[PDB]
Amino acid sequence: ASDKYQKISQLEHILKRPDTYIGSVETQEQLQWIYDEETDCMIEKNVTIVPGLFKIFDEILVNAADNKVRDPSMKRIDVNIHAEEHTIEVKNDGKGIPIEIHNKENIYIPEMIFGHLLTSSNYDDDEKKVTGGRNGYGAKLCNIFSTEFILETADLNVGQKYVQKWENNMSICHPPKITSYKKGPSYTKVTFKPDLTRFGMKELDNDILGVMRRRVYDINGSVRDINVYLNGKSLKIRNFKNYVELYLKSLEIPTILYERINNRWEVAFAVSDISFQQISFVNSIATTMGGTHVNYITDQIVKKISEILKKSVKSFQIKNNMFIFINCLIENPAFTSQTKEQLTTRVKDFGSRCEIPLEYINKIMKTDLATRMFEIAD
């Protein structure tokens, strides 16, 4: 009976069952937005991508964005994708990783938080934080799903440079090379080579490159006060309104209605062609499966439109003519999984509210939505 039952390690379970950590490691046929460089705008495309591969990139991206929360003096993210060499680099400025041996773990802190599961600066929820990072997995998950993983950082308090290489799904950990550093700014650079074989791929194809690239545009659109560079090119999205307007050409009384509701909430609206559509971000994370924040906003808009039509029309008819954009900040958010695709935090625990002004719903009532809704009623 012994063979019937097995005990496995945390690390073994991640490699065996990637789904709850990074999403599927199988190819998925998806309708995805990508940024078209020739038309300088968003295009919806049928792609085939491996979610887990996109997600290990996303983990490093959101970590960089989180450092802007930790250090508001940070000014730039650099993303460099070397397709041919399957190598991806993510660099941020502002404060680096402290080059110190940890009191308890007795290893260098960078080795600790990039090379050991369940390590985080986000474990003390006494503090209400608007970082995306929550559970102490993201960076290690990337490491685990890489043939090679390199952490480079510079710390000004100690005046040192720190380079550490992991290999073979985080199973090989080389000692760090630490050198002297009085060379300008602090920074962190993460350089990884995904285990493409683990994702059933031989190379980075145009589909995955397209969505990776677009995700970088997302970061620029959702995070304020940073410059975002992709393969050397400054993306120069000035704000979330500018980001949403990248979708303008494809969608085509304004086509997009944008409003900043408060310091933690921005929303945009457009009329949807076939069914309900949403693009939303919580603390820079792309909530592709929506959740409590999306529902909080849409419910308000649908509720009011229903009242207007009443003085015949079911709520679903209203909702399915809506394309909503949301950029929001939520305190200590909770999600259905590590992939953080769906927010579960109750509204009352958001740390803020977003009461959509009646005048904004009035503007929605001038769009094609109302004409469609008055045809069903009358």
**89 within 8 A of 97, measured Cβ to Cβ:** no
Three-state DSSP at 359 gives helix
Residue range at the interface with ligand ANP (CB under 6 A); choices 63-71, 203-211, 272-280, 345-353: 63-71
Longest dimension (CA), the chain: 76
Choose from ligand ANP, a second copy, Mg ion, none: what does 92 bind? Cβ within 5-8 Å by kind: ligand ANP
> Is 120 annotated as ligand-binding?
yes
How far, in Å, CA of 9 to CA of 185, rounded? 40
Question: Closest by alpha carbon to 365, among 286, 269, 280?
Answer: 269
- Binders in 94-123 for ligand ANP, by CB under 6 A: 97, 113, 119-122
Q: How far is the CB of 361 from a second copy (least distance, A)?
A: 21
**65 within 8 A of 132, measured Cβ to Cβ:** yes
How far, in Å, CA of 64 to CA of 188, rounded? 8
161 binds ligand ANP (CB under 6 A): no
| Residue 342 identity | Q
How far, in Å, CA of 220 to CA of 102, rounded? 34
- Binders in 310-349 for a second copy, by CB under 8 A: 314-317, 320, 334-339, 341-342, 344, 346, 349
Binding-site size for Mg ion (CB under 5 A) equals 3
**Cβ-based nearer residue to a second copy, 142 or 244:** 142
**Cβ-based nearer residue to ligand ANP, 69 or 251:** 69
> Which contiguous run of DSSP H or E holds residue 58?
helix 51-70
73 binds a second copy (CB under 8 A): no
Strands 172-173 vs 257-262: parallel, antiparallel or unpaired: unpaired
Residue 9: HSE in the Cβ half-sphere, 13 Å Cα cutoff: 5
Choose from ligand ANP, a second copy, Mg ion, none: what does 188 bind? Cβ within 5-8 Å by kind: ligand ANP
**281 within 8 A of 332, measured Cβ to Cβ:** no
Name the residue with tokens 């494809």. 250
Q: What angle do CA 234, 237, 240 make, to 5 degrees?
A: 155
Choose from a second copy, Mg ion, ligand ANP, none: what does 274 bind? Cβ within 5-8 Å by kind: a second copy
**80 within 8 A of 57, measured Cβ to Cβ:** no
Q: Which residue's Cβ lies closest to Mg ion?
A: 138
CA distance readout (Å), 22 to 16, 18, 290: 12, 6, 17
Residue range at the interface with a second copy (CB under 8 A); choices 21-29, 40-48, 211-219, 244-252: 21-29
Residue range at the interface with Mg ion (CB under 5 A); choices 133-141, 187-195, 208-216, 287-295: 133-141
**Cβ-based nearer residue to a second copy, 164 or 339:** 339
DSSP 156-208: TTTTEEEEEEEETTTTEEPPPEEEE--SS--EEEEEEEE-GGGGT-SS--HHH
Q: How far is the CB of 273 from a second copy (least distance, A)?
A: 9
Q: How far is the CB of 359 from a second copy (least distance, A)?
A: 28
**290 within 8 A of 342, measured Cβ to Cβ:** yes
**Cβ-based nearer residue to Mg ion, 63 or 191:** 63
Q: How far is the CB of 169 from ligand ANP (least distance, A)?
A: 15
Choose from a second copy, ligand ANP, Mg ion, none: what does 109 bind? Cβ within 5-8 Å by kind: a second copy
> Which contiguous run of DSSP H or E holds residue 68?
helix 51-70
Q: How far is the CB of 152 from a second copy (least distance, A)?
A: 18
Q: How far is the CB of 2 from Mg ion (least distance, A)?
A: 19
Annotated binding site for ATP: 63, 92, 120-122, 133-140, 338-340
Contact residues for ligand ANP (CB under 6 A)?
A: 59, 63-64, 67, 92, 97, 113, 119-122, 133-140, 188
By the criterion CB under 8 A, which residues form the site for a second copy? 1-10, 12-13, 16-17, 19-20, 24, 26, 28, 98, 100, 102-105, 109, 112-113, 116, 118-121, 123-124, 134-136, 274-276, 289, 314-317, 320, 334-339, 341-342, 344, 346, 349, 375-376
